[PDB]
Design a binder for this molecule. Sequence first.
Ligand SMILES: CCN1C[C@H](C)n2c(c(O)c3c(=O)n(Cc4ccc(F)c(Cl)c4)nc(C(=O)NC)c32)C1=O
Ligand SMILES: CCN1C[C@H](C)n2c(c(O)c3c(=O)n(Cc4ccc(F)c(Cl)c4)nc(C(=O)NC)c32)C1=O
Ligand SMILES: [Mg+2]
Ligand SMILES: [Mg+2]
Ligand SMILES: [Mg+2]
Ligand SMILES: [Mg+2]
Ligand SMILES: [Zn+2]
Ligand SMILES: [Zn+2]
Lengths: 269, 269, 213, 214, 210, 212, 210, 210
Amino acid sequence: PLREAKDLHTALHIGPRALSKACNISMQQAREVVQTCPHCNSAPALEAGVNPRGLGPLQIWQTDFTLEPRMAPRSWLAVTVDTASSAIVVTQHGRVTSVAVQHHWATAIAVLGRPKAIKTDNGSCFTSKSTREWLARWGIAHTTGIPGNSQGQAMVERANRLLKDKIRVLAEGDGFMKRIPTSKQGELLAKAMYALNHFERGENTKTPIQKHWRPTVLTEGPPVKIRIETGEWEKGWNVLVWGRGYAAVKNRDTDKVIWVPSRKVKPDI
Amino acid sequence: PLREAKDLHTALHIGPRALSKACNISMQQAREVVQTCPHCNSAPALEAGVNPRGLGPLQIWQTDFTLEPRMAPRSWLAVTVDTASSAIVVTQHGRVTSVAVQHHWATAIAVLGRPKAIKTDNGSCFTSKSTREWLARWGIAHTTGIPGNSQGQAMVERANRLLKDKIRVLAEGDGFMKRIPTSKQGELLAKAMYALNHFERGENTKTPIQKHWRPTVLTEGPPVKIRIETGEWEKGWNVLVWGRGYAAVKNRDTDKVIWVPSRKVKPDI
Amino acid sequence: PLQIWQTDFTLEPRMAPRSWLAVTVDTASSAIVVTQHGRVTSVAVQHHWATAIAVLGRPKAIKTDNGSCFTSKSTREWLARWGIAHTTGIPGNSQGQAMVERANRLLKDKIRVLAEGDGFMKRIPTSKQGELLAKAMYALNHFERGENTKTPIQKHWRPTVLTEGPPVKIRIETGEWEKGWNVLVWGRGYAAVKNRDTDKVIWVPSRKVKPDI
Amino acid sequence: GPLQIWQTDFTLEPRMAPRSWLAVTVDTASSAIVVTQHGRVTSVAVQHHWATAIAVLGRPKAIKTDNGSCFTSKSTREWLARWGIAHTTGIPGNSQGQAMVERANRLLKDKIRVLAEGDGFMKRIPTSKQGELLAKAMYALNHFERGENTKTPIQKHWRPTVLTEGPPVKIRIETGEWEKGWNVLVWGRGYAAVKNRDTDKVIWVPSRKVKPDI
Amino acid sequence: GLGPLQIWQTDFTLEPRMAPRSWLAVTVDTASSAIVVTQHGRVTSVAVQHHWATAIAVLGRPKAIKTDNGSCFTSKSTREWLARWGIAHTTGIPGNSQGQAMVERANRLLKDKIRVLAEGDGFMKRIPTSKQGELLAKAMYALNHFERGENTKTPIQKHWRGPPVKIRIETGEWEKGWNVLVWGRGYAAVKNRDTDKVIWVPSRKVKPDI
Amino acid sequence: PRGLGPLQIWQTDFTLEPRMAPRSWLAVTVDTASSAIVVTQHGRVTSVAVQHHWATAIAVLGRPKAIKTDNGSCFTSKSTREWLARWGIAHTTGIPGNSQGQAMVERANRLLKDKIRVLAEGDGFMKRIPTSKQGELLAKAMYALNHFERGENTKTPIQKHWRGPPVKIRIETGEWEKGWNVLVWGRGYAAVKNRDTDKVIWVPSRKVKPDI
Amino acid sequence: PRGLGPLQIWQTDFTLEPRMAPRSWLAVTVDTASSAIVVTQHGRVTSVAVQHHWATAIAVLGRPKAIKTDNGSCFTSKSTREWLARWGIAHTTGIPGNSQGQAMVERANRLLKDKIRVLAEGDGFMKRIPTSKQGELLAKAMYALNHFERGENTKTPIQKHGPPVKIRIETGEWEKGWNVLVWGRGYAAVKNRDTDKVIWVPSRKVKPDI
Amino acid sequence: PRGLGPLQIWQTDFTLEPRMAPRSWLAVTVDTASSAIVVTQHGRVTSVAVQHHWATAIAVLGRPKAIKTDNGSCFTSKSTREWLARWGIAHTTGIPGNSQGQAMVERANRLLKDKIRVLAEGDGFMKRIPTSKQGELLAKAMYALNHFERGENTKTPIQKHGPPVKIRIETGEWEKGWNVLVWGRGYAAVKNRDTDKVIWVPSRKVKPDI
DNA sequence: ATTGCATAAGACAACA
DNA sequence: AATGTTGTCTTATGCAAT
DNA sequence: ATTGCATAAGACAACA
DNA sequence: AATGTTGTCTTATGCAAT
Ligand SMILES: CCN1C[C@H](C)n2c(c(O)c3c(=O)n(Cc4ccc(F)c(Cl)c4)nc(C(=O)NC)c32)C1=O
Ligand SMILES: CCN1C[C@H](C)n2c(c(O)c3c(=O)n(Cc4ccc(F)c(Cl)c4)nc(C(=O)NC)c32)C1=O
Ligand SMILES: [Mg+2]
Ligand SMILES: [Mg+2]
Ligand SMILES: [Mg+2]
Ligand SMILES: [Mg+2]
Ligand SMILES: [Zn+2]
Ligand SMILES: [Zn+2]
């Protein structure tokens, strides 16, 4: 008898277990009676695909900005990470003007080389005139993220937090608890850049610099078991790079390079 | 050679693995040179003990407040949950004056009985003159939580969210998308209370009401394996109630009743 | 209990303006549920019965009078939706509305004594009406009246306090699941179980425990 | 090999007032030039320069400079000793202590004016564009060739290649014998995909199933 | 323009290429920019009738033809041609800005393209008796089914002719009344239901409706 | 044999209607897939007339990847091949009067003759028509052929010019009925839409399965 | 509040206490700066009772620079005069009880009498205290009135004569300079080094330094 | 021999002095670490005089914790024995003449007698003190031994008057002497008894003290 | 077999 | 217009020794 | 042994 | 003054059948 349950749910909106116990019912009638109310299931699947990356060195960069009170009155620092090798370049200025970004990108070019793209948020001196024609004159792409989520550039933000950690540790391990004199600004900047770049981070065997200058990239890797959207797994695919977080996979015929979560991929046979 | 590592860390603050790789070092020198910097370890153990509860019915109650736009112009609803059995009583008024709390507690008394304590946050008409003198005249305790974290009343807040879920589901499944006419206010109120109280929630076998009126409480339970803050587990203790979230344990000689997280407790032998 | 109910409306002068006093009385327990109404309607009865159902539960019948609001369609299809079988009666009959009249008398006496003992003679303040309603309900539901060995609550709910978990069987080493055991606590992976005779607690795997009957 | 001896001096550049003192760092195994400019001439400012230069290039082994007041002043001396670099001085301009220094000085004093005239700056570049000018000059001096070989200074310095394989690891086999001849490509969770060094045969093998080789 | 096969602007021009038959006939649809040209070396009622009719055969049956006060266009022959064809006629100077000007621009395009085609074949100003129709037809093909300008649809392609999801906003509430236009891999564009303005949103900040 | 693709292969021929006289001769040009035709009705037959008609047709209809004509001295002329190289279209020839690619051409030719005759008898000219209304007759005939459907065919020759995977769902009866296409798929359900009613309904991932 | 230090200016007088009978008289030394007390016991007015008083007070609380008194008869007596001549401290007169000479010893006498009365009622002696409990009840009275601060001040009259933790703020930072006093089960209280004030904070909202 | 801290250890004895007849039965009491000597006269050995003397000492020195005394029928009397618990003061009584604990008090008695002598024959009351002079002469001698000198010191006497766990150091040995006040899941907050300093040591580097 | 170890797997946080 | 990331920490697990 | 099932375990969210 | 909670969902796992 499922229609006492029909009336009970429609008038009362009960959970399936109490419906089953309150009308002498079993699995099916309960489950696809409690589906039938659209109000009982509104949110509970929010799609989430999460994947920015670049494949080889000097392909894709990122950029954000930092307010650092210890560096007054030049507190504004620009950050730039190379997504392929996680090398960081940080510069110091007074304002967030386009000229500061000019100088910062020039120094990053002098240090790391010339990239192809720079993903980012839409700063006020950033989609500005001068920056845009100067970038066109230099001749590299420029792909702003969605205007309002400071999350599509998650790499530069994460390296931003890491740089702030390192800079504060160095500053207040050096006897400066609140702020820094004008003399030790270059000290802190150079030490932060040297510590992060030339020395490995976490568990990885490879240093950021000798990732950036002697990179390893595979041409044809192993097979994997992955998604199609069709609901669950297919095989007949290969993986290029499988980071701790998220991975890149390649077709066998279409020859696509698509960034998918590591949940999305698992080993073949 | 750990002194190259000593100088390197003190001047540069390196992760332990890069120190081990950069000076031909191993487990011990790496670890207990990397702790020596106080800046490399500041936060990373934040104490968190999480345990409000009452043991038997009508022992401890809770209270919060609700803004429900669908119930204009009487949007202010009080909430009260009996922590032992999770029974809910909610009333409706116009303002957050002390008289509303008077009437709400009077109705809750009429429905559930007389409790011993009412834990809570410090509302403006709540530690007030009239409320305190009236509570003294009735003769029950009154234990406010920490003034500013609406989290020590997590039970009433959670039952608050659940009540809002049920009330909205019923209202906008009844054909009212934005607000409720004055006719259906009692409809929604009494329907929410009947649905929540007399029908079980989640997976439990027991209804809140016949938890409240025919409760089960053990007098001497099983032995278990638990925290003394000394660092890790001992045994020689007994558990009274072990909820899915958190549990209550009792000594064998001191005869204490303490609320500890289920993390702290695990089965004996 | 929860087999037959009743209802009526009796005027209260001091309750101005909301002066119509709904009553509902169970038979096997004689509990009382009461709320205020500005003026009697065919929706006020539904409101009051929703409140009474919230407080007590769902009855199996109702015995009111042949009043205008108790007979109109609204309440009829309300009780049809819920599953409560309406059954009217002569407005004043003793085979029907007798204990509800006794409850009316009890409630009027209780309201008068409470209002006089709280410092009022003919007009209870508007902000203090539901206060006296809840006091009357509490006093008449949780306290014995006259020579009753119990209050309405004890008869209504049977408030025994059991101390042993539900009967459950455990996978005995021979593969069978012998009954006569009782769980006490459901921990992590294990569920401590006693024996109904030996009174010994033994932690057992969760995969090997299933209820009795 | 690379990164064995460094060099350094100053250079008076009136083209960049008021910051009229410009410092140059020159490697000698690869000639990867690094420059920076500072308004005054004290100890802390040039030390700032050395910090930036070592940040860009890395830790040298020795630094041969002049007999200047600050190159051997106390602060600089214990600072370099803390860093661990074998300082060396000499005659102020000797063909051994400033051999490549003056060559790179000529190169930079050429590039500065070349680019200043390229963007149209004759007397003094404004105090806002010296940074980008110096960055562009260093980019054209380091990543770009001015010699006549097939190796840029970056090609000499960091030994840039483009690998295809990582470290080799020794898988063990189902009978209990470890086996080299295999190299790792992907550290998937639980399973490593290791390629046969002979037949280019990759196989998904578990984590504890493999151990590093040598 | 709004839709093709509606407004036709037929004008005549002189090209010294096809001399002595140097006069030309061309129709232009302002709504589609499609062009029909038929060789006619004598501006006459018969010539304009024949060119109009070949244009109808090429493009489609119109609803109005817009020309000027040329006496060969309102003649009784032309009037009855339009009458039996059930279309409309409006006169002019011509030389209006918004109308009767795209035809002149198309005439400039026609002369330039026929000139470049002829010089690509090896003809400077005079073209043989077996080449004038050839060149005009080549110019027609080059202009019609090859896109000119900066659009995505060729001029002939300028001739005749989701589910709801709730999104979270800054305060955290979920609002209905949106739909998915395009859906990639980690992003989607959402259009409103009433204002119909399209905004882009992360895939994680959208949940379905009903 | 019509599922190759529109604007791909064009068939042309010369049929002499008894009405276009004394400018009697006529060239045809048809497309196999699109069923779209356009003509000019000249007063002479020659390679120059051939290419004038051809380059009017390619302007009218589209860009074929091949245009076919029967072998003869009226289509293999070298100026014609120079025009071909100016457009770069591959070519081949066959028997003059075979069933390989000319049966449909002659069918359309007889269609042209009958439509032209009925139009002429509608206007009032029974055998011959003046040199001023030939074009208007051609215009009406061409519009009738292209814009409107010929016979019972739903697809007009216009509709064959420039024109989610199939899935089957589960009903309470369990019927694996077809007629659904996913739009915005999810990992717990799908956004399918019917192919005729075109209504959107999110259905569980545990009730859909592929169609072929 | 005179700015002079302790041991400088004294004030003296007697009192009649029938509670301590038949030893019915008492006297106390007080200082205008420290207001500290020393007590004796007697049953009659003599020039030697004041000498007992002076010896006890100068032994307990050091030497006075100067003493201000009244015009009592035995204060000028020969014995105490020779005593003072040996001491080295001057003796002064006045009008017996004005606002310049007798500063606070009168209120000291009143406070001592009421304190001994409240102590006698605390241990249960209403009418009078016998010659045995005298020393004990006294000693309790002096200890309470000297060893403990009375009134309000930055230092007690005898003075006159938590690991660091970081707490959260709603802005979201971690303020430094807080010491935990009591460590509850899941709560805490913190006192700031500068503002020396206690505020209660949960355990999941606190992390320490170093 | 030099103590550890004031107001934590005490030592007493009994003395008789013939010149104070009849009330010649004193009850001497001296501190150890602070070396404060205080006395009080009486004329019989009894519980009443002992309790009076101890209650006077309580507030002339400070509230006591545990006083080491000698054998007798007065310290061990029911009134005095329960009095010790009433004030929560303990007993570690020794031999009537034990050298380890009463040599100091006997030397103090010799000092007291010699001072009383020298000062008494200074004033001119040679052999025995009358009734009205005993208090002042006792005051005189204690005054001679309050705040001038004790006899040898450059630092005079009245000028001076969590569960244990082992931890770990880089040395590798587990040092004791640390008590935890606040606990955490990754470290602790230990404090040494001597240096009374609080330091957060990680939980890996501790183990229980016995 | 029990304790300790060497590593892998999973969880938390915060950046205008 | 165009999508989270990963260093640091904790816990669990398996090998190696005793 | 492979598919489906019946249940247990773990993860997310939001309440002024 | 006085400490998270828990319904709902997802995934993983094991029994039972075929
Ligand atoms: C106008 C220029 N502009 C726009 C705004 C002001 N903005 C910019 C920032 O850099 C950030 C930023 O870093 N985060 C921190 C953050 C928060 C969540 C994450 F997931 C990640 Cl990776 C980073 N937030 C914001 C912000 O607006 N609202 C949270 C933000 C910025 O520079
Ligand atoms: C003045 C009376 N008063 C004080 C303030 C206004 N308050 C009161 C509320 O009821 C709440 C409340 O419910 N929550 C929601 C919430 C947030 C996090 C949790 F963990 C849980 Cl357990 C609940 N927050 C606040 C608040 O202040 N800041 C987040 C709050 C309230 O009534
Ligand atoms: Mg940012
Ligand atoms: Mg930004
Ligand atoms: Mg709240
Ligand atoms: Mg609240
Ligand atoms: Zn529902
Ligand atoms: Zn460090």
